[PDB]
């Protein structure tokens with residue numbers, strides 16, 4: 001219940017949405033009582049690699065504004081040696097909170113949300129970005145439309161959406177994002193994530209890598225949706241469907 005100034009404009013704090021490590025997200029109001037969301041980043045103890053992660057994200061978020069309206073709007077930012085203030089658009093709820101709350105999920109709504117996600121992820125891919133950590137939390141609902149809020153660039157954690165090739169990478173391509181998007185859609189379809197059954201985290205990782213671990217796809221009145229899920233959840237990235245291929249899929253094109 002204080003106020004902040006961003007590029008000579010005063011914003012009164014309505015409420016705090018999020019709290020990260022060195023960051024805070026607020027629902028704020030301008031002089032004309034218009035709502036915005038302000039991301040505040042305290043830089044006081046951030047390292048060179050951390051500052052560069054924050055600078056890269058702001059540059060990408062600022063460039064990608066113009067390429068899609070499925071990417072969160074960034075009106076303005078203030079960047080000093082001490083802080084970051086990002087003036088952005090306000091959404092009603094994130095997809096994770098929305099999915100946890102929603103008992104039933106309408107096929108028309110699911111399909112529209114899938115399309116929204118494919119467009120956002122496709123845009124970041126066209127600019128050489130692979131998010132690599134997609135989960136419902138990265139999507140905000142803003143006037144019935146899902147928007148991507150994060151690019152995976154800046155640095156509870158859920159191993160439930162991790163691609164099999166990301167686990168193998170110990171001794172990551174656009175296909176990695178296809179696996180994660182497929183998990184979100186599997187959740188929106190069957191009410192759960194593919195490897196949510198495995199309560200233990202150690203064995204959950206073995207399951208994603210195990211080719212003989214059959215993922216269940218119970219029959220749906222939407223057979224097109226069933227193929228999307230079977231194509232996204234292919235353990236071999238080489239055999240996994242691509243985003244340009246998903247945009248031409250009958251599930252997205254045929255109503």
Ligand SMILES: CN1CCN(c2ccc(C(=O)Nc3cc(-c4ccncc4)c[nH]c3=O)cc2)CC1
Pocket residue numbers: 017018025037039072088089090091092093094097140149150
């Ligand atoms: C019961 N429900 C009520 C609704 N509720 C939420 C949860 C999250 C957000 C949110 O993150 N909002 C925003 C987040 C961001 C953002 C955050 C991080 N990086 C970039 C942009 C930008 N604009 C926003 O409006 C807004 C509302 C959860 C509990």
